[PDB]
Amino acid sequence: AEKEKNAAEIRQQFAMTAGSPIIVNDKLERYAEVRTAFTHPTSFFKPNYKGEVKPWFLSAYDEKVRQIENGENGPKMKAKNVGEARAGRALEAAGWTLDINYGNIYPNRFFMLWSGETMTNTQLWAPVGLDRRPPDTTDPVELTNYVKFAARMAGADLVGVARLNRNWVYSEAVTIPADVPYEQSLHKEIEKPIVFKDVPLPIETDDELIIPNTCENVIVAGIAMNREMMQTAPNSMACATTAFCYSRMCMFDMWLCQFIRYMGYYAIPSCNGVGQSVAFAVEAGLGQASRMGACITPEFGPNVRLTKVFTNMPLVPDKPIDFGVTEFCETCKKCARECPSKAITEGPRTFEGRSIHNQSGKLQWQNDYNKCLGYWPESGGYCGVCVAVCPFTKGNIWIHDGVEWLIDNTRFLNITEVWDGKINTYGLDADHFRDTVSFRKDRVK
Amino acid sequence: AAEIRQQFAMTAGSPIIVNDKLERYAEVRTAFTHPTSFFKPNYKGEVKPWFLSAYDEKVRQIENGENGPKMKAKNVGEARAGRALEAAGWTLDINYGNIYPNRFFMLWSGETMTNTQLWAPVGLDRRPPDTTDPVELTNYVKFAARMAGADLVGVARLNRNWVYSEAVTIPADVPYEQSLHKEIEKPIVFKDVPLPIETDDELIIPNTCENVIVAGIAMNREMMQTAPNSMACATTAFCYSRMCMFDMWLCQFIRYMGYYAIPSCNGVGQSVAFAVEAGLGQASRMGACITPEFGPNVRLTKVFTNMPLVPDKPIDFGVTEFCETCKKCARECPSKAITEGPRTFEGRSIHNQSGKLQWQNDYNKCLGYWPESGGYCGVCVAVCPFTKNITEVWDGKINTYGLDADHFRDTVSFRKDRV
Ligand code: SF4
Ligand code: SF4
Ligand code: SF4
Ligand code: SF4
Incomplete structure (x- = not known):
């Protein structure tokens, strides 16, 4: 008889002994955030469909407008009518509501404050003094249970803990000067060193973003995207589920930072900023690195967004997981063949970055992420194919198979219907939502 | 669950019975804001703003390793944790309910929002609507609502009877830190204007604001069953921030579709009346809207719009007849706030709106228990x-946003359920 699928069982079976699974050599150096294709001068500019060179997101805007006017849901993809094309872009745009400039990357700005002190919620609750009272719990085991319970309340579908590996923290962040208003942010970005020092609390000076040496841990969350919407990639509904999850990420960070602070510790939010989410996620045991470059998880595959919070709160690190992703990616190459920009390599893993956008010195499949970003204005979205x-x-x-869990090898051999089809709260799926149920035994051993 | 709802669907028309005495209700009259009820003693006998007195009780409980009134926690650490979680949950809510209209998160226009500014070149909020068909719009907007975190969504024509006559708000340029000390009253009026607008004197809603979209935001059963203790406060708190995010997400979608939208959370008008008219559930003895999926263990928010929409049918699954014989909430209420008597048209005090047939409760008695218990009760x-107990909750079942996979199928939605 059919074995009732068991996500907890699966994770136990594939858990590895302690130790960062990421393989590195001597040329590894921390990576300046400005080097990402979103921000580096070599890649930030892309032509629009008239050949005008603009910031990538403005050229993508040009394509969205063109598609709506032409009744399309994506590149060469006819919508049912202009009304439908419009709605997909309205949904996508709305999704980004709680996110700054496609990712909340500027640290200690807008939603990503490194201290709770000025937040309206903090001010309201000040007479209770939860943020000033010394911790009443120092036991990492109880703390792990508490903070994970809180994280699920805060919208995480997956959550894991790792020691903070500084190799994945950006050497310098992209940010904006403190006196610069939002409307000028995009034309006033600067770089700022992220450094570790002997200081009691996360603090920013004119010169540096300073993380205390006591910042021992990172908490990584997975925010699940919607399967039906993502499968319309690269068209508009895939952009919408992507967008809503960025706002969910933001809520998560603030909710969790506040919980941690009110427990008597400090907490640094980040969303897409501060450090490389995939590396943290892999070290925290959410999943494994893959050919396309994402963290693939047992519950959602790569169809899940990541965010992370850094803290001095004592915690128990989770074990990394190995469920055979690496061996499947070696033989599969489906993402590489389907990629509209041919950005993903079909070759072996190496320690040498393909270009400035990759961090050399860690064993990974090296993809050309300038080619990736190039298809975004072309398609008018965030692709996701x-x-x-x-x-x-x-x-x-x-x-x-009666003894253990395994992956089915057979699996490796329209937008109107989505709008008219199944949906549920936050685009989660009741047919699989049992997979992320959590009891204490799931949160800490 | 969709089966259940179509079985108990009633014909069109508001199920709320009213007489000729009914007047719109000034928000300041609520127990939260009225001068007669706003101040309560703390446990030392000091008179303070109700929430400040409630803070003193929370501090006192933490120090004494308690999760609620005379409810011992496993240890001080646990007590601390419950309050830290409760406090965090409110992160995206202003002053316990987001009631000030057109302030902070509750902006009546999207124009100054960072998201709107980033997306300005696409022109979605300036482009005339490409869809005016109410059937297609109802389907689009409900899909959007579920994306935005609603567990239930319904549409009704806007009954102005339930819109507050005057809102509680603050002056536009007053900073958050002075807000509680500078609350004022401001008329909400309807006029022939193209867009929602605020003047020095008035909050102006267009006469074209035809509809209200009501959302239900499900609370966590295990945590609510710890009422009046701290974990019941925590699921309450987290769902207020979910309300806020829903309003903002949905308003943005509606604006980007070419219409206008007014967010509200606990402000602007009375959620329970709207929810009943939009068919989410029925009014009850305790005063809440009881839903088939969640009973009353669900929060409400709503958005007002000129977007053409198909109103949902009100529902009657026997709540009124059940509440007539049950009286369990009234027996259990720690403050005896809830009447065991028949429904009347006459309010028990200033906090009630007279002129509508309902069970009349004494909500100053209810608020009175909140400083005493150091939370928001919910018994x-x-x-x-x-x-x-609360240790078993902390060690027990949880899932994303405190939703329950055993019941999450009940809120699945296809087109046939949307329009
Ligand atoms: S498509 Fe295949 S090769 Fe690409 S990441 Fe998925 S499993 Fe790996
Ligand atoms: S263009 Fe980018 S997002 Fe699209 S399939 Fe290729 S790598 Fe993935
Ligand atoms: S009378 Fe009973 S059924 Fe009605 S609201 Fe109270 S407890 Fe619930
Ligand atoms: S005090 Fe208020 S919240 Fe508590 S049971 Fe009575 S009416 Fe309900």
Whole structure:
């Protein structure tokens, strides 16, 4: 008889002994955030469909407008009518409501404050003094249970803990001067060193973003995207589920930082800023690195967004997980063949970055992320075709052979219907929502 | 669950019975804001703003390793944790309810929002609507509402009877830190204007604001059943921040579709009346809207719009007849706030709106218990049949946003359920 699928069982079976799984050599150096394709001068500019060179997001805007006017939901993809095309872009735009400039990357700005002190919620609650009272719990085991319970309340579908590996913290962040208003932010970005010092609290000076040496841990969250919407990639509904999850990420960070602060510790939010989420997620045991470059998880595959919070709160690190992703990616290459920009390599892993956008010195499949970003204005969205076609993204990949769990190798061999089809709260799926149920035994051993 | 709802659907028309005495209700009259009820003693006998007195009780409980009134926690650490979680939950809510219209998160226009500014070149909020068909709009906006975190969504024509006559708000340029000390009253009026607008004197809603979208935001059953203790305060708090994010997300979508939208959370008008008219559930003895999916263990928010929409049918699954014989909430209420008597048209005090047929409760008695217990009680929600220790909650079942996978299928939605 059918074995009732068991996500907890699966994670126990594939857990590895302690130790960062990421393989590195001597040329590894911390990576300046300005080097990402979003921000580096070599890649930030892309032509629009008339050949005008603009900031990538403005050229993408040009394509969204063109598609709506032409009744399309994506590149060469006819919508049912202009009304439908319009609605997909309205939904996508609305999704970004709680996110600054596509990612909340500027640290200690807007939603990403490194201290709770000026927040309206903090001020309201000040007479209770939760943020001033010394911790009443120092036991990492109890703390892990508490903070994970809180994280699920805060919208995480997956959560894990790792020691903070500084190799993945940006050497310098992209940010804006403190006196610069939002409307000028995009034309006033600067770089600022992220450094570690013997100081009691996270603090920013004119010169540096300073993280205390006591910042021992990172808490990593997975925010699940919607399967039906993502599978319309690269068209508008895939952009919408991407967008809503960035706002969910932001809520998570603030909710969790406030909980941690009110427990008597400090907390640094980050969303897409501060450090590399995939590395943290892999070290925290959410999943494994993959050919496309994302963290693939047992529950959602790569179809999940990541955010992370850094803290001095004592915690128990989770174990990394190995469920055979690396061996599947070696033989699969489906994302590489389907990629509209041919950004993803079909070759072996190496320690040498393909270009400035990759961090050399860690063993990974090296993808050309300038080619990736280039397809975004062309398609008028955030693509996501690699996520959509990855077999791990499919809802039913796991089978049980009577003794243990394993991946089904067979799995590796329209937008109107989505608008008219199944949906549920936050785009989560009741047919799989049991997979992320959590009891104490799931949060700490 | 969709089965259940179509079985008990009634014909069109508001199920709320009213007489010729009914007048719109000034927000300041609520127990939260009225001068007769705003101040309560703390446990030392000091008179303070109700919430400040409630703070003193929370501090006192933490120090004494308690999760609620005379409810011992496993240890001080646990007590601390419950209050830290409760406090964090309110992160995206202003002053316990986001009631000031057109302030902070509750902006009546999207124009100054960072998201709107980033997206300005696409022109979605300036482009005339490409869809005016109410059937397609109802389907789009409900899909959007579920994306935005609603567990239930319904549409009704806007009954102005339930819109506050005057809102509680603050002057536009007053900073957050002075807000509580500078609350004022401001008329909400309807006029022939193209867009929602605020003047020095008035909050102006266009006469074209035809509809109200009501959302239900499900609270966590395990935590609410700890009422009046701290974990019941925590699920309350987290769902207020979910309300806020819903309003902002949905207003933005509606604006980007070419219409206008007014967010509200606990402000602008009375959520329970709207929810009943939009068919989410029925009014109850305790005063809440009881839903088939969640009973009363669900929060409400709403958005007002000129977007053409198909109103939902009100529902009647026997709540009124059940509440007539039950009286369990009234027996359990720690403050005896809830009447055991028949429904009347006459309010028990200033906090009630007279002229509508309802169970009349004494809500100053209810607020009175909040400083005493150091939380937001909720005992009535917890004991209500329609809804069905703290260490076991912290060690027990949880899932994303405190939703329950055993019941999450009940809120699945296809087009046929939307329009
Ligand atoms: S598509 Fe195949 S090769 Fe690409 S990340 Fe998924 S499993 Fe790996
Ligand atoms: S997002 Fe698109 S263009 Fe970029 S790597 Fe994935 S499939 Fe290729
Ligand atoms: S919240 Fe508590 S005090 Fe108020 S009415 Fe309900 S049971 Fe009574
Ligand atoms: S406890 Fe009983 S009387 Fe009170 S609202 Fe629930 S069903 Fe009605």
